[PDB]
Amino acid sequence: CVNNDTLSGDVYTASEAKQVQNVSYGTIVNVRPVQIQGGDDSNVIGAIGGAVLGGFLGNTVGGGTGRSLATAAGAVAGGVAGQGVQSAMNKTQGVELEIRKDDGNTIMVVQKQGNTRFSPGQRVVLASNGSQVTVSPR
Amino acid sequence: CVNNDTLSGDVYTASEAKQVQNVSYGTIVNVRPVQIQGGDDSNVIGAIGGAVLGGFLGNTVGGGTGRSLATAAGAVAGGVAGQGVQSAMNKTQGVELEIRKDDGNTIMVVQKQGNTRFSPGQRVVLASNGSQVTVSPR
Amino acid sequence: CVNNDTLSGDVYTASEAKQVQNVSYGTIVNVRPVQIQGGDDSNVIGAIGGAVLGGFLGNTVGGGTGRSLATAAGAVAGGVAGQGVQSAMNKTQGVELEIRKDDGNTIMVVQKQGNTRFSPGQRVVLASNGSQVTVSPR
Amino acid sequence: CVNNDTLSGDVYTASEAKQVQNVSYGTIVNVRPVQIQGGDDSNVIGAIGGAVLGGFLGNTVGGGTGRSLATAAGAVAGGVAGQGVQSAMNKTQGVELEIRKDDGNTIMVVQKQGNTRFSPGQRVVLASNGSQVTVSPR
Amino acid sequence: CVNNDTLSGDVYTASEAKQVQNVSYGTIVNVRPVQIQGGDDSNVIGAIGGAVLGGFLGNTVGGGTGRSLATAAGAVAGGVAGQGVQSAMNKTQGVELEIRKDDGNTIMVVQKQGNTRFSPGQRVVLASNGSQVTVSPR
Amino acid sequence: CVNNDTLSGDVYTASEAKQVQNVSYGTIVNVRPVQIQGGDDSNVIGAIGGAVLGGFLGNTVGGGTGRSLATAAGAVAGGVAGQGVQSAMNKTQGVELEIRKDDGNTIMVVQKQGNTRFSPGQRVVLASNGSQVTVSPR
Amino acid sequence: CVNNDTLSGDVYTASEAKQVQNVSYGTIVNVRPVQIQGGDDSNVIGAIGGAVLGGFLGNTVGGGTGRSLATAAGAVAGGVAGQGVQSAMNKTQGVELEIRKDDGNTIMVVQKQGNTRFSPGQRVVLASNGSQVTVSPR
Amino acid sequence: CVNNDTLSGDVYTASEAKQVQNVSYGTIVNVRPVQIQGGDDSNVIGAIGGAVLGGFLGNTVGGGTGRSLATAAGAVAGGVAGQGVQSAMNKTQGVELEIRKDDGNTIMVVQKQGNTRFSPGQRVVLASNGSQVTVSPR
Amino acid sequence: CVNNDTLSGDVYTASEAKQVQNVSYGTIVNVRPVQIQGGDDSNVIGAIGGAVLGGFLGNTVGGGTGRSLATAAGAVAGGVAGQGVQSAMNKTQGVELEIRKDDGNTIMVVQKQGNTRFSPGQRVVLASNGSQVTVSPR
Amino acid sequence: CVNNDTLSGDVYTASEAKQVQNVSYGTIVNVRPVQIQGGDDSNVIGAIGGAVLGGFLGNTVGGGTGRSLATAAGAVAGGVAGQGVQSAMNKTQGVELEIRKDDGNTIMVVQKQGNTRFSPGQRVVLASNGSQVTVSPR
Amino acid sequence: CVNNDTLSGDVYTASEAKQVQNVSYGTIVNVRPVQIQGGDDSNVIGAIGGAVLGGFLGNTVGGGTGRSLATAAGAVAGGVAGQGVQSAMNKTQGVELEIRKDDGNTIMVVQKQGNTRFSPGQRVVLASNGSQVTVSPR
Ligand SMILES: CC/C=C/CCCCCCC[C@@H](O)CC(=O)N[C@H]1[C@@H](OP(=O)(O)O)O[C@H](CO[C@@H]2O[C@H](CO[C@]3(C(=O)O)C[C@@H](O)[C@@H](O)[C@@H]([C@H](O)CO)O3)[C@@H](OP(=O)(O)O)[C@H](OC(=O)C[C@@H](CCC/C=C/CCCCCC)OC(=O)CCCCCCCCCCCCC)[C@H]2NC(=O)C[C@@H](C/C=C/CCCCCCCC)OC(=O)CCCCCCCCCCC)[C@@H](O)[C@@H]1OC(=O)C[C@H](O)C/C=C/CCCCCCCC
Ligand SMILES: CC/C=C/CCCCCCC[C@@H](O)CC(=O)N[C@H]1[C@@H](OP(=O)(O)O)O[C@H](CO[C@@H]2O[C@H](CO[C@]3(C(=O)O)C[C@@H](O)[C@@H](O)[C@@H]([C@H](O)CO)O3)[C@@H](OP(=O)(O)O)[C@H](OC(=O)C[C@@H](CCC/C=C/CCCCCC)OC(=O)CCCCCCCCCCCCC)[C@H]2NC(=O)C[C@@H](C/C=C/CCCCCCCC)OC(=O)CCCCCCCCCCC)[C@@H](O)[C@@H]1OC(=O)C[C@H](O)C/C=C/CCCCCCCC
Ligand SMILES: CCCCCCCCCCCCCCCC(=O)OC[C@H](COP(=O)(O)O)OC(=O)CCCCCCCCCCCCCCC
Ligand SMILES: *C(=O)CCCCCCCCCCCCCCC
Ligand SMILES: *C(=O)CCCCCCCCCCCCCCC
Ligand SMILES: *C(=O)CCCCCCCCCCCCCCC
Ligand SMILES: *C(=O)CCCCCCCCCCCCCCC
Ligand SMILES: *C(=O)CCCCCCCCCCCCCCC
Ligand SMILES: *C(=O)CCCCCCCCCCCCCCC
Ligand SMILES: *C(=O)CCCCCCCCCCCCCCC
Ligand SMILES: *C(=O)CCCCCCCCCCCCCCC
Ligand SMILES: *C(=O)CCCCCCCCCCCCCCC
Ligand SMILES: *C(=O)CCCCCCCCCCCCCCC
Ligand SMILES: *C(=O)CCCCCCCCCCCCCCC
């Protein structure tokens, strides 16, 4: 598992506490919903778990030289299902926001859904660092 | 398997959440369909799976010194089929779009087919970063 | 465990004693509560502890070739719970402060809750270094 | 095997989707046919497969100390044939095109044969990147 | 253990003897007490000691296959307590001083409590190097 | 073996497909025939093959302590012949051409013999890259 | 042990013999006594010695499965005492001197106590190198 | 063995085919014969071959503890002869030529003897690259 | 042992023979005696010798499980004495000289005592290199 | 052995064939004879050969525990003689020449004796490269 | 052993043959005798030889557990003597020369004694390179 709950507007990772961050103001338009896929593309941990759990389910059939074939088939047929499952428990739902600043410049930012509802027409304050931004309501 | 579903216009990888992205506008012409081939060219994981599953199907014929020949032949004849199959499950279908911006400059971008249909003559908004672009309808 | 108690306004890590730090003054507005998530995202130590403690609970059922299946299942079903638990004991509660300096510039800083209560309207003194800040009351 | 089907004008590798590419126009003259040789020059995978399959065909003759000689001879006499065969299944047929752009500058590009026929006298559109080009008909 | 007694105003580490250090003068205001946490955040030595001492307390109960479960549980239940204890014996008490120099510039420095008492209103002499300072009374 | 058939004027390596190449014109004079020696100077693969095939031909004579001498002699007397043979199957025949460009500058290039005959007095077109050239007839 | 007797004003390390050193003059004020702590903070050699000497004192009590517990407890209870003792035999006594040069500039230097007594009001000669100084009486 | 036949005026190494080379003209004077010594100075492959072939010729004399002495002596007395012989089969015969160019500048180049005879007074054409030259007759 | 006899004015290390060195003249004042401590601070070779020689003196007392305790105690009680002795045989006696050059500049140099006596008031010649000096009498 | 016969005026190493070298003229004065010492200073190959050949000559005397002493003594007493002999077969005889060029500049070069005699008063031609020179008679 | 006979005025190392060296003239004054110490300061090869030869002289006394003590003592008591002897066979005798050039500049150089006698008042010629010099008589 990967704990991608540090991608909300209500939780800070501990490597950015006790630092300085700048402040700007803006306005909000055109929110639409979006899905977020964390983790890594080459799933390795799922493969090994699936492989062992599928292989040890193979010994219990047959006997002789027909048992080795069963365990060998079960190994790969569980290995692929491991990657099948390990990349469907790392999928959350978020929103995409288009904010227009008071400078006159427009940007958009994507952020995980929490327990506050964003609406078209509102005032937000941007807490920013070098290439990092958090958006919080009024 | 490789999870190339992060190449759509409705799914964001989690390493580009909580960042700033610029906004432009444009118009759409000349969409045509295209196929997309993910993964890597040197298939290694397919070779080993094919090899073991083909080798363990060789012991069950013959006996003596004619069993070793059977298992040795089965090993390679399954090894090549492993790469044959592992590079036909990583093939998806997408579209290629030619968008003309309001600057007066023309570009084209290629993107995976989803559940929205693009048509000739429409307004799109480009969300851009340094050498990254996502296209979404009006 | 990770000892993230060095993120308070009353405890200094020992690698920043006997050094020089600058002093500024400011005023405080708009405190709101926030949670803090320490540690690292890829939980490794939890996985091994969960795995061993789940595996050694598997031998005590069944016998023959039905014991191996039980221990193999218990191993992974404890492995995932290890990461489930090891990333819920590293979660503390803090505050977020917006301070306006006497220069005329505005910043905000996030800091762990202690035993002093911050209120809207107060005088604070910032002890600063290069990209490090501690806030302490009057 | 090497999957050199990403060298056509109808298939895009997945590492160049969702990017920006420029557009130019031109005219076509002097197409002639050409062969294309993929892969790598030092064939290693063919050698091992040929070696094992030739060696295990050696035990079945003779007995005593005249069996070792047979297996040793078969090993190398299959090893060289492995490289003989593994570099004749990576050979495709393509075309070479000489296109004159509307700038007044002339270039030529080589590309794999597909299912569309190029003729002398036609209009093509070049989709280009930094040192990458794809040619597609009108 | 970590010997953090070289963080006082009466003990010099031996890698800064026979060197040259500059001298300044100042005045002292606003001392307040503070705690100091040495060592390192990832406690490793505590984990192994706790693990072995907890594991060898497990064999003495039960017998058969119920002994392995006891030793496995004791191992982790002592492992976490090892880190619990090894990071509570590296905690000392010090003071924080705000000194105003004769230049007209203000700084503050934090230093371990010894056997001399600092008071508001006094003369101190700063012995300094590049980014190192020791404060000693008149 | 080394597959040096990518050194002709009718076969392109697959790492230079879908790229841009410049075009020039010229005239041809003074072709003379030449031999080409591929591969590498320190022959290693030939040594091991020769060594094993010569050594296993030594056991079949004599017995006692006079067999070890025979196998030891055969090993080296086959080892040197391995390098003798492995560097006589990598030798092809090509031509050397002196072409005078329309600029007024003269160069010469060497290229493997194919199935087209070059003659003194003819028109050729040079397809060029940075320090790469292919010559093809009119 | 660490031989920190090369930190006196009467002993030179052998890597700074046969070199050139500059000469200055000064005057001496305000000597006060100080302690010096050599060695390294992470004590490793003490831990192993304490561990072995404590462990081999554990076998001599009890018998059965109650001997293993005794040796395991003795190991750690001697391990910590090893670091307790190995960092109390590397502690010497020295002096701190404030010397005012004839330039008009003031410095202070710290140096191990020997067999000569420094007094307030005296003439000293500084033998100096790049960031190295030795002070010797008249 | 080392195949130093790529040092003639009639054989090209395959890493310099399909490249561009410049052309100059000159005249020839003062050819004299010279020997050429290829390979490497520290002969390693000869030592091992000589050592094994000399050692296995030692067992066939004597018996008891007088056999070990014989094999040990034979090992080194064959080892040195290995380097004696392996550096006398890498010695060829060539010529040294002094050519005066039409610029007015003089150079000389050394090249292996082939099947063409160079004479004093003749016209040669130099095919050159960066610090590489081949000389061929009219 | 360390052979620190190359620190005299009558012995040259062999890495500075056949080189060029400059010559200057001067005068000598204020010689005083000094001790020199060679070697390295972390004594390793003494520890192992002391450890083995102390450990093998432990077996000769007692028997049973009271022999292991004796050998374990002897090991460390000889280990520390090894470092005690190995750093008292690398201590020589030298002199420190203050020489005033004819330029008008003053320096001092430290050098091992030999068989010539230096006196206040004498002429010396300095043989110098880059940051190396030897002093020899008239 | 080291084959230092490539240091004559009649043998070229094969890494400097087919290159360009410049030509100068001069005159010869003051030849005197000199010895040349090749190889490397730390003789390793001689030590091992001497060691084995001396050790295997030790078993043939005595018996019991007096044989081990003999073999141990013979090992080192042959080891030193190995380096004694291996550095007396790499010693050749050469000449040193002082040549005055037609520029007006003087140099000298040292070169191995061959089969031509140099005399005072003669004309030589220098074939030169960057920091390489060969001298050959008229 | 180390062969430091390449530090004379009559023997050239073979890595500086066939190179160019400059020539100067001078005059000679004030030769005095000096000793030269080659090799390296940390003697390793002597330690092992002394250790083995001393250890194998220990078994021949006593029996039981009193033999181990004898061999252990002999090992170190021979080990130190190994370094005692291995650094007294690398000591030669040379001379130090002060030469005044015709420029008007003075230098001195140190060189091993040979079979020619240098006297006060003579003419020498310096053969020089970058930071290398050899001095030879008229
Ligand atoms: C707070 C919570 C605390 C937690 C833990 C604390 C509890 C501690 C209390 C300790 C008490 C315990 O000591 C008592 C005891 O065990 N006592 C036991 C002990 O006696 P003692 O007391 O020790 O003296 O031993 C006896 C011996 O048992 C048998 O011994 C034979 C050999 O023994 C012999 C011999 O011939 O050599 C003869 C004998 O006389 C003697 O001499 C021995 C001698 O010992 C030599 O060593 O040797 C074996 O044949 P073999 O070896 O030659 O092959 C045989 O297994 C055999 O031959 C082969 C077996 C194997 C087939 C079972 C697999 C099912 C597939 C499910 C996956 C689904 C896929 C999607 O085959 C069979 O058993 C045939 C069953 C056919 C029907 C199956 C239907 C199931 C599917 C339904 C699906 C429904 C869908 C809707 C074996 N059965 C056996 O050992 C037992 C076998 C019986 C199957 C019951 C079905 C349950 C399946 C439901 C699934 C759960 C939800 C997912 O059970 C097991 O192998 C363990 C099963 C684990 C499965 C986990 C699934 C993981 C998830 C999926 C992973 C992919 C047991 O009877 C005793 O009783 C019993 O054990 C009765 C017991 O009450 C039943 C077991 C319950 C455990 C289940 C929970 C596990 C969950 C996870 C754990 C972390
Ligand atoms: C040019 C120069 C050439 C150089 C070399 C060439 C010489 C070659 C000639 C060969 C002849 C030789 O083959 C003859 C022979 O050995 N012949 C011998 C041979 O017969 P074969 O001919 O082989 O057939 O074997 C016999 C067997 O001997 C005994 O055998 C017992 C077991 O044997 C049994 C059994 O019961 O199992 C029974 C038996 O019947 C038979 O069956 C065997 C069978 O073989 C099974 O294997 O088994 C052992 O008991 P165990 O095993 O169960 O434990 C016993 O040792 C035992 O039980 C245990 C012993 C051990 C205690 C001794 C340690 C002393 C501490 C000093 C350190 C100071 C610290 C600061 O305990 C005792 O011996 C009790 C002694 C109590 C009094 C000690 C006082 C000393 C202190 C004084 C301090 C004064 C201060 C002012 C053992 N003694 C023994 O094996 C002998 C034991 C006797 C002690 C004498 C005191 C000397 C100490 C002075 C110190 C010197 C200066 C520093 O001696 C030794 O262990 C070697 C001692 C080495 C000490 C070196 C010190 C190093 C420096 C300090 C290091 C930190 C010997 O008698 C024969 O005679 C003898 O051996 C008599 C002999 O003349 C005496 C030995 C002299 C050697 C000394 C020189 C070494 C210096 C360095 C060398 C490089
Ligand atoms: C941070 C979490 C770390 C988790 C690691 C714990 C591993 C637990 C292994 C259980 C071993 C059971 C063996 C079978 C039972 C038996 O009857 O075992 C019997 C045998 C000996 O008994 P006999 O005397 O009867 O032969 O072995 C033992 O008794 C071994 C002692 C068990 C305890 C060892 C301590 C744990 C390992 C060291 C800690 C390292 C931590 C590293 C953290 C990074
Ligand atoms: C974080 O998520 C860590 C990785 C989690 C791996 C989960 C593995 C589950 C594998 C299930 C396989 C079922 C096999 C069924 C028989 C073929
Ligand atoms: C992601 O896709 C991981 C790699 C998947 C590998 C799939 C391997 C399948 C191999 C089938 C081989 C069949 C052999 C039949 C007998 C020769
Ligand atoms: C700091 O916090 C160190 C890591 C702590 C790891 C804690 C591991 C607890 C695992 C509990 C698993 C329970 C399994 C129950 C049966 C499946
Ligand atoms: C992609 O193409 C992977 C490599 C394919 C290797 C194919 C190997 C075939 C070898 C056949 C050898 C036949 C030997 C017959 C007896 C000497
Ligand atoms: C410096 O402080 C070195 C590290 C010290 C480690 C101390 C380890 C103490 C562990 C105590 C564990 C008690 C376990 C009780 C049964 C679970
Ligand atoms: C590409 O060419 C791969 C290397 C090919 C090696 C061929 C080895 C042939 C060796 C023949 C040796 C014959 C020995 C006869 C008895 C001494
Ligand atoms: C230089 O000082 C080298 C390191 C010295 C280590 C000294 C170790 C002493 C350990 C004493 C432990 C006593 C244990 C008593 C029973 C628990
Ligand atoms: C290319 O040339 C590869 C190296 C060739 C090595 C040849 C080795 C020949 C050794 C002959 C030794 C004869 C020993 C006779 C008894 C002492
Ligand atoms: C150069 O000096 C090399 C290192 C020399 C090491 C000397 C070691 C001497 C150790 C003596 C120990 C006496 C132990 C007595 C019983 C405890
Ligand atoms: C090139 O020269 C390779 C190294 C040659 C090593 C020669 C070794 C000769 C050793 C002779 C030793 C004689 C020992 C006599 C008894 C002590
Ligand atoms: C070049 O000089 C190589 C190293 C030479 C090592 C010589 C070793 C001699 C050791 C003599 C030791 C005598 C021990 C006597 C009994 C203690």
CATH of the domain at C34: 2.40.50.840
Interface test with C, best of E107, E124, E129, E135 (most C CBs within 10 A): E107
Rounded-to-integer distance, Cα A45 and Cα A83, Å = 8
Q: Within 10 A of H39 (CB to CB), how many other CB atoms are there?
A: 19
First to last CA, chain F: 34
Pocket flag, ligand 10, residue G82 (CB < 6 Å): yes
Rounded-to-integer distance, Cα B36 and Cα B111, Å = 9
First to last CA, chain I: 34
Adjacent-strand bridge partners of G93: G35
Residue C84 corresponds to which amino acid?
G
* Residues within 6 Å of ligand 8 by CB: E 1, 45-46, 49-50, 53-54, 57, 77-78, 81-82, 85-86, 89; G 80
CATH classification of the domain holding G116: 2.40.50
Residue A4 belongs to a domain: no
Number of folded domains in chain I? 2
Residue C1 belongs to a domain: no
Task: Give, for ligand 8, the residue of E4, E44, E45, E89 to mutate: max count of ligand atoms closer than 8 Å to Cβ.
Answer: E45
Residue B3 belongs to a domain: no
Rounded-to-integer distance, Cα C81 and Cα F67, Å = 66
- Experimentally, the structure was elucidated by cryo-EM
Residues 6+ apart with CB under 8 A from B8: B111, B112, B114
Residue E9 belongs to a domain: no
DSSP class of residue I104 equals S
Residue J12 · residue J5 · CB < 8 Å: no
| D36-48 as b/e: b if 16+ CB within 10 A | bbbbeeebebbbe
Same-domain check for residues I106 and I132:
yes
First to last CA, chain G: 34
What is the residue-wise DSSP string for F2-56?
--TTSSSSSEEEGGGSS--EEEEEEEEEEEEEEEEE-S-SS--HHHHHHHHHHHT
Q: What is the resolution of this structure in A?
A: 3.4
- Token pair of K36 as six digits: 């030269």
Residues 6+ apart with CB under 8 A from K105: none
Q: Determine the distance separating the centroid of ligand 3 and the alpha carbon of E51, expressed in angstroms.
A: 9
Same-domain check for residues G99 and G121:
yes
Residue D53 · residue D114 · CB < 8 Å: no
Residue C7 belongs to a domain: no
Q: Please give the angle made by the CA atoms of D47, D48 and D50, to the nearest 5 degrees.
A: 65
Residues 6+ apart with CB under 8 A from B131: D19, D20
Which residues in chain E are contacts of C49 at CB distance < 8 A? 76, 79
Rounded-to-integer distance, Cα A110 and Cα A106, Å = 14
Adjacent-strand bridge partners of H107: H99, J22
Same-domain check for residues I25 and I60:
no
Rounded-to-integer distance, Cα G57 and Cα G74, Å = 7
- Token pair of H5 as six digits: 């036949």
Same-domain check for residues I57 and I124:
no
- Token pair of D13 as six digits: 């590798």
Interface test with C, best of A22, A56, A59 (most C CBs within 10 A): A56
Left, alpha or beta for J121 (phi > 0: left; psi -120 to 50: alpha)?
left
Check H83 against J56: CB less than 8 A apart.
Answer: no
Cα J81 to Cα E108, H10, H55, H79, distances in angstroms: 72, 51, 22, 18
H and C touching (3 or more beta-carbon pairs closer than 8 Å): no
Rounded-to-integer distance, Cα F99 and Cα F109, Å = 8
Closest to B133 measured CA to CA, from B3, B5, B7: B7
- Token pair of E5 as six digits: 């007694």
Q: What are phi and psi of F90, to 5 degrees?
A: -120, 45
- Whose alpha carbon is nearest atom 111 of ligand 2? K70
Residues in chain G: 138
Rounded-to-integer distance, Cα F102 and Cα H35, Å = 43
Cα D85 to chain center, whole Å? 15
Same-domain check for residues F22 and F50:
no
Pairing of strands K106-112, K91-101: antiparallel
Rounded-to-integer distance, Cα B99 and Cα B107, Å = 6
Q: Within 10 A of B131 (CB to CB), how many other CB atoms are there?
A: 8
DSSP class of residue B59 equals T
- Whose alpha carbon is nearest atom 17 of ligand 12? I78
- Token pair of F64 as six digits: 């006692």
Q: Within 10 A of H121 (CB to CB), how many other CB atoms are there?
A: 7
Rounded-to-integer distance, Cα I131 and Cα I136, Å = 17
Cα C138 to chain center, whole Å? 26
Same-domain check for residues H78 and H97:
no
Residue H51 belongs to a domain: yes
Residues 6+ apart with CB under 8 A from A103: none
Radius of gyration, CA atoms only, chain A:
23
Closest to I10 measured CA to CA, from K93, K7, K85: K93
Pairing of strands H106-112, J21-37: antiparallel
Cα F71 to chain center, whole Å? 35
Residue G3 belongs to a domain: no
Rounded-to-integer distance, Cα B83 and Cα B44, Å = 8
DSSP class of residue E63 equals -
Same-domain check for residues F29 and F96:
yes
Contacts 24+ apart (CB under 8 A), H112-118: H112/H4, H112/H5, H112/H7, H112/H8, H112/H9, H112/H36, H112/J17, H113/H33, H114/H8, H114/H9, H114/H10, H115/H10, H116/H9, H118/H28, H118/H31
> Mapped to the 3 state alphabet, what secondary structure does K80-125 carry?
HHHHHHHCCCCEEEEEEEEEEECCCCEEEEEEECCCCCCCCCCEEE
- Whose alpha carbon is nearest atom 17 of ligand 6? C78
Same-domain check for residues H52 and H31:
no
Adjacent-strand bridge partners of J133: J128
B64 class by beta-carbon count within 10 Å (0-12 exposed, 13-18 middle, 19+ buried): exposed
Residue D5 belongs to a domain: no
Rounded-to-integer distance, Cα F111 and Cα G77, Å = 80
Same-domain check for residues G77 and G112:
no
Which residues in chain I are contacts of K72 at CB distance < 8 A? 52-53, 56
Residues 6+ apart with CB under 8 A from H36: H4, H7, H91, H92, H93, H94, H110, H112, J11, J12, J14, J17
- Token pair of B24 as six digits: 């432009």
Among the bound ligands, the one closest to the CA of C3: 6
Residue I5 · residue K37 · CB < 8 Å: yes
Adjacent-strand bridge partners of A12: C36
Residue C101 corresponds to which amino acid?
K
Residue I111 · residue I95 · CB < 8 Å: yes
Cα J127 to Cα H25, H70, I40, J116, J135, distances in angstroms: 21, 51, 53, 18, 7
Check D108 against F13: CB less than 8 A apart.
Answer: no
Cα atoms in the 13 Å half-sphere on the side-chain side of K91 = 13
Rounded-to-integer distance, Cα C108 and Cα C98, Å = 4
Check I36 against G12: CB less than 8 A apart.
Answer: yes
Rounded-to-integer distance, Cα D44 and Cα D50, Å = 10
Q: Within 10 A of G54 (CB to CB), how many other CB atoms are there?
A: 21
What is the residue-wise DSSP string for D36-76?
EE-S-SS--HHHHHHHHHHHTTTTTS--TTHHHHHHHHHHH
3-state secondary structure at position G55: helix
Q: Within 10 A of G66 (CB to CB), how many other CB atoms are there?
A: 11
First to last CA, chain A: 34
Same-domain check for residues I34 and I49:
no
Rounded-to-integer distance, Cα A113 and Cα C121, Å = 32
Cα atoms in the 13 Å half-sphere on the side-chain side of E98 = 15
Pocket flag, ligand 10, residue G53 (CB < 6 Å): yes
**Helix, strand, coil percent values for chain C (each to nearest 5):** 25, 35, 40
Rounded-to-integer distance, Cα J137 and Cα J122, Å = 8
Cα E77 to Cα A124, G73, G125, H27, distances in angstroms: 47, 17, 64, 92
Name the residue range of residue C78's domain.
45-86
- Token pair of B71 as six digits: 């298992």
Residue G91 · residue G35 · CB < 8 Å: yes
Rounded-to-integer distance, Cα F35 and Cα A60, Å = 66
Same-domain check for residues G81 and G99:
no
Secondary element (H or E) of residue J79:
helix J66-86
Rounded-to-integer distance, Cα J43 and Cα H80, Å = 15
Left, alpha or beta for H30 (phi > 0: left; psi -120 to 50: alpha)?
left
Residue I131 · residue I109 · CB < 8 Å: no
Which residues in chain F are contacts of D69 at CB distance < 8 A? 56-57, 60
Same-domain check for residues F96 and F117:
yes
Closest to A6 measured CA to CA, from B17, C86, C95: B17
| Beta strands per DSSP E along I1-131 | 11-13, 21-37, 91-101, 106-112, 123-129
Check C37 against A13: CB less than 8 A apart.
Answer: yes
Q: What are phi and psi of B12, to 5 degrees?
A: -110, 135
Cα I75 to Cα C17, C134, G47, G49, K64, distances in angstroms: 40, 51, 15, 9, 21
Radius of gyration, CA atoms only, chain K:
23
Left, alpha or beta for G49 (phi > 0: left; psi -120 to 50: alpha)?
alpha
Task: Give, for ligand 3, the residue of E56, E59, E61 to mutate: max count of ligand atoms closer than 8 Å to Cβ.
Answer: E59
Adjacent-strand bridge partners of D35: D93, F11
Secondary element (H or E) of residue A48:
helix A45-55
Check B19 against A109: CB less than 8 A apart.
Answer: yes
Q: Please give the angle made by the CA atoms of D52, D56 and D58, to the nearest 5 degrees.
A: 125
Cα E49 to Cα E67, E80, F58, G78, K128, distances in angstroms: 21, 10, 62, 12, 67
